[PDB]
Amino acid sequence: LRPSDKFFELLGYKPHHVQLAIHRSTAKRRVACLGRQSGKSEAASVEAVFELFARPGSQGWIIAPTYDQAEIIFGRVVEKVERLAEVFPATEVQLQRRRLRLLVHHYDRPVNAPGAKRVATSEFRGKSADRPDNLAGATLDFVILDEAAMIPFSVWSEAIEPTLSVRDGWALIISTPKGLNWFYEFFLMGWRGGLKEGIPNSGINQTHPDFESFHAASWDVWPERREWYMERRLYIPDLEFRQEYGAEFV
Secondary structure, three states, rough: OOOHHHHHHHHOOOOHHHHHHHHHHOOOOEEEEOOOOHHHHHHHHHHHHHHHHHHHOOOOEEEEEOOHHEEEHHHHHHHHHHHHHHOOOOEEEEEEEHEEEEEEEEEEEOOOOOOOEEEEEEEEEEEEOOOOOOOOOOOOOOEEOHHHHHHHHHHHHHHHHHHHHHHHOOOEEOOOOOOOOOHHHHHOOOOOOOOOOOOOOOOOOOOHHHHHHEEHHHHHHHHHHHHHHHHHHHHHHHHHHHOOOOOOOO
């Protein structure tokens, strides 16, 4: 199952075309190469909230290059989780902000009723690629990689991938591109939108069935902001413009 329109209305969430494309995908590896202001954080956070409530017991991580970057999405998951638990009487939220750890306990009846027994607990943690030591494994049903192109591949291949494969969990791998590194390879394994400027080997690339890839420049999400973006090229180095806004692999 995936999050529905009904679930989006519970969240007060109105996704755009790109976000929606991501939510409708069932690929176990989703790779999103998007420009700034694409809505990446929200769509990621919405995915985490769903798992926690719809798959009681599920365990997931969000990891970013730094604890400060991870705190963004984690914070949005907290708001949504705590608010949403109001319409799920048989849940109770527990938070440890300092450890970036969020617990959703599920009960065999409404929490405010006598005799309430704790059946399952869902867990969500924030993690940092620059704190490898705190990446002691856990059995993950899901994981979000934020600014993935700036996370060393080793963190994926050694600390994340293997645990996912255990419970056959999914990964949402998001970034603005940072040249032709591992993130670009992964993007290409899922790219089915044919030839496109900014994406080398597109249109002749192979794809893996478990991979689905999404692409959007900032001005694709915000067309009315295109001119502004373009006029920033006057004081933004060209390569920074092509990547952060144009979402180009360079």
